Design a binder for this molecule. Sequence first.
Ligand SMILES: *[C@@H]1O[C@H](CO)[C@@H](O[C@@H]2O[C@H](CO)[C@@H](O)[C@H](O)[C@H]2NC(C)=O)[C@H](O[C@@H]2O[C@@H](C)[C@@H](O)[C@@H](O)[C@@H]2O)[C@H]1NC(C)=O
Ligand SMILES: *[C@@H]1O[C@H](CO)[C@@H](O[C@@H]2O[C@H](CO)[C@@H](O)[C@H](O)[C@H]2NC(C)=O)[C@H](O[C@@H]2O[C@@H](C)[C@@H](O)[C@@H](O)[C@@H]2O)[C@H]1NC(C)=O
Ligand SMILES: *[C@@H]1O[C@H](CO)[C@@H](O)[C@H](O[C@@H]2O[C@@H](C)[C@@H](O)[C@@H](O)[C@@H]2O)[C@H]1NC(C)=O
Ligand SMILES: OC[C@H]1O[C@H](O[C@@H]2[C@H](O)[C@@H](O)[C@@H](O)O[C@@H]2CO)[C@H](O)[C@@H](O)[C@H]1O
Ligand SMILES: OC[C@H]1O[C@H](O[C@@H]2[C@H](O)[C@@H](O)[C@@H](O)O[C@@H]2CO)[C@H](O)[C@@H](O)[C@H]1O
Ligand SMILES: *[C@@H]1O[C@H](CO)[C@@H](O)[C@H](O)[C@H]1NC(C)=O
Ligand SMILES: [Ca+2]
Ligand SMILES: [Ca+2]
Ligand SMILES: [Mn+2]
Ligand SMILES: [Mn+2]
Lengths: 237, 237
Amino acid sequence: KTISFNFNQFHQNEEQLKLQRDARISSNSVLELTKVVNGVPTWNSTGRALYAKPVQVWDSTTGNVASFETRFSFSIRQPFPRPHPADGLVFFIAPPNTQTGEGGGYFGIYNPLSPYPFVAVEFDTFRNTWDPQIPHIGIDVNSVISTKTVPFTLDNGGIANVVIKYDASTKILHVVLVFPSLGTIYTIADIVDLKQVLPESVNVGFSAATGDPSGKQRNATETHDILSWSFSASLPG
Amino acid sequence: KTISFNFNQFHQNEEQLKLQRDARISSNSVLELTKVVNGVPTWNSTGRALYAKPVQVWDSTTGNVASFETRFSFSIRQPFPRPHPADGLVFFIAPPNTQTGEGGGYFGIYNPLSPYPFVAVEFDTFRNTWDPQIPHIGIDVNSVISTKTVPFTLDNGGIANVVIKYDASTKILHVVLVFPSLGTIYTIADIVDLKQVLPESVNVGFSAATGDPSGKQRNATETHDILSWSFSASLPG
Ligand SMILES: *[C@@H]1O[C@H](CO)[C@@H](O[C@@H]2O[C@H](CO)[C@@H](O)[C@H](O)[C@H]2NC(C)=O)[C@H](O[C@@H]2O[C@@H](C)[C@@H](O)[C@@H](O)[C@@H]2O)[C@H]1NC(C)=O
Ligand SMILES: *[C@@H]1O[C@H](CO)[C@@H](O[C@@H]2O[C@H](CO)[C@@H](O)[C@H](O)[C@H]2NC(C)=O)[C@H](O[C@@H]2O[C@@H](C)[C@@H](O)[C@@H](O)[C@@H]2O)[C@H]1NC(C)=O
Ligand SMILES: *[C@@H]1O[C@H](CO)[C@@H](O)[C@H](O[C@@H]2O[C@@H](C)[C@@H](O)[C@@H](O)[C@@H]2O)[C@H]1NC(C)=O
Ligand SMILES: OC[C@H]1O[C@H](O[C@@H]2[C@H](O)[C@@H](O)[C@@H](O)O[C@@H]2CO)[C@H](O)[C@@H](O)[C@H]1O
Ligand SMILES: OC[C@H]1O[C@H](O[C@@H]2[C@H](O)[C@@H](O)[C@@H](O)O[C@@H]2CO)[C@H](O)[C@@H](O)[C@H]1O
Ligand SMILES: *[C@@H]1O[C@H](CO)[C@@H](O)[C@H](O)[C@H]1NC(C)=O
Ligand SMILES: [Ca+2]
Ligand SMILES: [Ca+2]
Ligand SMILES: [Mn+2]
Ligand SMILES: [Mn+2]
């Protein structure tokens, strides 16, 4: 049972994508997770993009767990250096049919009033009380307080290539971050037992957020654009 | 005791390196592991390059294991497409003071008549009976029969960037392969317990080999050049 899809670009009204909140697809085919008006990103924005169909990461009958690989390109343009850009974007897996969570440092995937489990890879740009120096790549399991973290230097407005791979047999989740214009390579890995944290069927997608109003800083913002994306998952079941 | 060295280039007569067999440093400063005469690589060649000093990967007193990161660039130029280039190059960790092993598919690190333990990351270009499709990246533990394998497409004569990282706490060895001219990214990871396979002190280095005479193919060859190399290890004990 192999499931896969590929988007070299994004078209408006794409039937295989579920856009939520501020998420929208632009004319020039880029997936803009957070709000951008007249070429300028605003604060108080939150958006998600889910692959319309659910994917099966494990089977209770056989006990088998799926292995998967996903690649995508994103771009984060930080127009206002001071006081501080916010908040970042993440790739995530969660139960099907969830709603957008809290914005800000929660990226729109965590909802304290009705927490739902999730596994996510974050590209954190703002330093919250629970964060190490930013920007950083982080592996999140049911929480925004990463299990593993690695710092990286952003290529403002540049293109970033990401490769995320999950090995069911070793339970290793390894992500690679590359900024082709700078030739920089960042790597991070950790052990995650999907069968233990998530249900058999899940949704895969992205979520991002800009500065929260409570910070009283309209400059706390940046873009969170997804340029392309492919996914592939295999269940030996 | 954090140890680390960096070679942005290679100088003739490098006090820091132990060259063995066919390994040499060229005029333009590249480390040529295997023989190349008048701009053409030959068969029946084997060479290794070890960092002169030994590194401590674990301490029996505290039981602690080191974490390390190594980056290097290499180039493999395959002049003769048919019938099949050979054999590839590896980055390895072995007990100090070892001797070059068998050539060919053994890369010069395995010696059947007196086997010594080793951990190595291979960039295999020839398909032996025990191999999957080539080229492929492979993680080798005391054997040339990889524990994990991933296929990749070579950039003939192009430059390749490699990042190898080892996490003592998770025991995850993850390697990343990038061909900047093509923008391709390959990743592979596995669990390796250094403390269980290697002695407290080891040598780190490279080894490569071209076609073995027994194959009767002089075209079974390619270059195995190392352009730069940085290493860093951190033992908490
Ligand atoms: C939010 O971003 C604005 C645009 O970058 C900041 O204003 C810019 O500040 C520059 C100083 O670094 C100045 O040279 C630019 O002319 C100015 N750009 C414009 C058209 O506003 C702004 O900084 C605040 O406001 C400016 C006008 C000054 O009063 C600064 O002292 C302020 O810090 C940023 N706002 C905040 C709260 O940082
Ligand atoms: C070993 O590599 C050689 C160079 O790549 C091969 O010879 C070249 O073969 C070309 C056609 O494949 C031909 O156009 C070239 O002129 C020739 N190069 C020269 C001038 O030597 C060689 O191929 C075999 O041997 C040559 C001499 C020819 O007889 C070919 O027809 C043979 O396939 C490669 N060896 C083998 C056996 O693959
Ligand atoms: C492979 O390289 C070795 C050097 O390490 C050479 O000795 C081999 O040459 C062959 O074997 C030697 C012992 C001698 O008989 C010589 O005449 C042979 O050519 C070389 N093998 C080949 C086939 O070139
Ligand atoms: O300003 C952007 C920022 O707003 C929120 O954080 C603020 C404040 O900036 C922070 O330092 C701390 O004191 O928490 C405040 C909110 O209670 C938001 O949580 C954060 O993610 C970011 O959007
Ligand atoms: O020709 C290069 C090749 O030689 C050796 O392999 C030969 C033969 O080419 C191969 O197909 C198989 O039959 O094994 C033979 C040796 O027993 C060598 O092992 C291989 O690594 C490469 O050098
Ligand atoms: C933030 O956005 C929400 C809806 O997205 C809106 O109700 C709220 O008033 C906004 N707050 C500010 C400060 O604009
Ligand atoms: Ca944060
Ligand atoms: Ca081989
Ligand atoms: Mn974080
Ligand atoms: Mn192999």
